[PDB]
Symmetry: D3
Subunit: 154 residues, 6 copies
């Protein structure tokens, strides 16, 4: 009965996120992606985009969440969070959060290293570049990319 | 059938290591501590010290290993490594190793953040301080500490 | 006479801050804790000052004042020319190194740092407040007097 | 005819920036300083002011010119038939941030980025910190070129 | 005429190095790859030079030489005063920033850095050799010519 | 009577070190520079040489003295009735490494450590790099005090 929560805003989910989802799903019996809730896509849109890109992962589900992440995790009978890390700044910031979360609620955090190909990817740089007409199609799931193009045109 | 290998030299195992062992054992169905093999304690001594301190963790075992870590992991039917991280330097160094290991063999690596109380602990600083008569008893399992005192006197 | 100013917003003061206060007061003849008045937080400056005074009652050579504007002015106006504070992380170091070099360049005021106590390395006032707001227990990260008053503000 | 674009807000240009301008101009046939403007947020200095301050302190660099722009930097670069960006780095944060931007820029447009290490004397200098210090009366005259210091004091008054 | 020296041990040259060679040669009128002779490695300096020449056959403005002693001397003796190399990580940056500032201080020679290609950020010669020694497949990290010769040395 | 120990190998002392000595002496009633010797590995300079070079460049610091030692630094500190260490930091690596040592030293002995930021001009200076550069003929005269430079050249000859 192993399991972990993979939290984020996912606005939108990137290939970097998706790689981490697949990797977590390969090592834990269940994975819950927690979409935390002022951006480009609505929560429902974000959830939909993630569900579409994770159809091939049977043991993964997607939910929205509010308030303390550790409460979200414990209310579901789990006590692990899983996330990817790209940079030293990611590590420093997430280590702080991980130690606070373990202190207040006993919830642990597991990190994985980014895929090298996606180390420079963020949802906010991808949206920014796309806005000015840069090609970010190699950084996003094919579905998400189309949804993005739609948002910028409308 | 989840599982991970927790590798290191463990010369000697510290409370920092032990905390990570317990945390990995809580989230994976099996954990193998892999003692990799020019220090203070022999491999057998290191294994013994770890086994003594992990008697309360039923799903953990301890083995020696040589050669490529990813071969050790795959020869045992696993494809995950688990380790703790204390510092930014830990993160940078281990990220490199993790990406190389995933590239050559598909073996993934999961990291956890050090317990705050042990963030400054290394086996080499503990041995060094103890050599000159500093009290490191709060940083090492009670068993290990006694074994250390014995090594310095003999 | 040796001395240093220990600056911050302290909204609220944490056990991390308090540890640094004690360690500074152990080494300098006088320490002045300077509570910065900004544009904004949870506690008023007077509330912050009282919480620090309660927590530092056993440090006779430490006093608490509010300040604003250029810190190196605050320091020099009190006949001192040293700042003291703690560092938790690499980002603390990078950020504070820049500020320290700027402060020494513009005014000749030096800055001394101490490493955080390991137990409080992950603590910040903002994160403590955030956690407490959603019901998390941060009582082991704050002095007793502060935790009570924090519960009061969240109600 | 080698060339690079040196981008920034330059609000205002500092001695750290100018040091990099000089070093870039010594190694590329032409250098274009690109004053990148956010049309949605004004800085302290207008685009004309920023350009003027840079020109006045780079008069002895014959192969350097100054132009403003907005939008994607890689478009500014390619529209001039170049494909190199050059800038300085002071800290580990600069390196992390600029490596991400450089990798993104090469990915989307094939434009490369060259970095130089800050002169040690100016490693702590930023436009924002200089402006902030000066706002409260601190002396930043040794961190900024003559073309800047008094105009900056003028804005603050 | 613009130009730069690209220094290293290249024992062996990797696809990471090669990417930087190509990017330097695209921007400078000439590039000199300088293979450092040390106290020690797997390949002789002549072997290293030949492997680089094979991999850089399509870069007409890049040449390969060996060198020893003070790098800024090597650079200036060839009428240049720029060094160029890649950076993978924060430790690369910290280390190379120190060396660059020292090299500019002592000789006026400047240093230009490029960011690693993301695909090769984790690559080092030492780690590639270590992995290959115990049978790991590093063929996607090295140029074709190098991988063959590496297999030869491990037998 | 406040006081701190400023430890190091000082093989040789640099201008970066001396800057820290001065700043420490300005803020503590007494400063003891501790020349820590590894009895199992000699450096370039003997203990007497290292001490001599430090004394010659600190003659105008009346509250500073120089002593050698070995073994645990916290014992050196406590045997003098002090419980503070003071030193400089230049880089993020220095901070990571020294924070570990400081936390270990306070844990085992209650001795505290105070750090100051390097002077920007000397941030890239180390004794090892200076020695290495000088070995191959590089000019490090601006990085080292007069008391050091020619003795260093003498050792290399
Ligand atoms: O920050 C972003 O916008 C963003 C977009 N893509 N990636 C990414 C890029 C490369 C690799 C893994 C993600 C990002 O980095 C976020 C890293 C922190 C993180 C928080 N929650 C997560 C859930 C799964 C994976 C990572 C995280
Ligand atoms: O490096 C050491 O000697 C040493 C001694 N104790 N700790 C430690 C201190 C605090 C927390 C977890 C360990 C150390 O840091 C090692 C960190 C990398 C690591 C490699 N293998 C591991 C297996 C389990 C846990 C960590 C590792
Ligand atoms: O940033 C915060 O909100 C916050 C809350 N607690 N601590 C802390 C946590 C652990 C140890 C020492 C403080 C924090 O870190 C601030 C670190 C920078 C600093 C600025 N002024 C200071 C005055 C005294 C001490 C530190 C500082
Ligand atoms: O960020 C600032 O406001 C600011 C003011 N001065 N300097 C500086 C300080 C010391 C050395 C080189 C600059 C700064 O750092 C910016 C570093 C990144 C950078 C982006 N574009 C650039 C163009 C030329 C040079 C640097 C950059
Ligand atoms: O350190 C190594 O063994 C090694 C093997 N491959 N790469 C590499 C990996 C990815 C990208 C560029 C190189 C390495 O990183 C070295 C980075 C520093 C560097 C010094 N001299 C250089 C010359 C050209 C390029 C880089 C350097
Ligand atoms: O590491 C070196 O060899 C070396 C030579 N000069 N500097 C230096 C360069 C710039 C500024 C302050 C020193 C060095 O950096 C050491 C930094 C850590 C340190 C340990 N003990 C010290 C005592 C006084 C000052 C610093 C230290």
């Amino acid at each position: 009965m192993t399991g972990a929560v993979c939290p984020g805003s996912f606005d939108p989910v990137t290939l970097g996120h998706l790689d981490v989802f697949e990797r977590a799903a390969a090592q834990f019996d269940e994975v819950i992606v927690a979409v935390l809730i002022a951006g480009m896509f609505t929560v429902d849109e974000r959830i939909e985009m993630i569900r579409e890109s994770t159809a091939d992962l049977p043991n993964l589900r997607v939910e929205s969440g509010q308030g303390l992440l550790v409460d979200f995790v414990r209310e579901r009978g789990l006590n692990a969070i899983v996330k990817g890390l790209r940079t030293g700044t990611d590590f420093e910031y997430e280590l702080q959060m991980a130690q606070m979360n373990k202190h207040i609620a006993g919830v642990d955090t597991f990190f994985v290293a980014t895929a090298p190909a996606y180390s420079f990817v963020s949802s906010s740089l991808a949206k920014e570049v796309a806005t000015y007409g840069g090609d970010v199609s190699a950084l996003l799931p094919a579905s998400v990319h189309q949804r993005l193009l739609g948002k910028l045109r409308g």
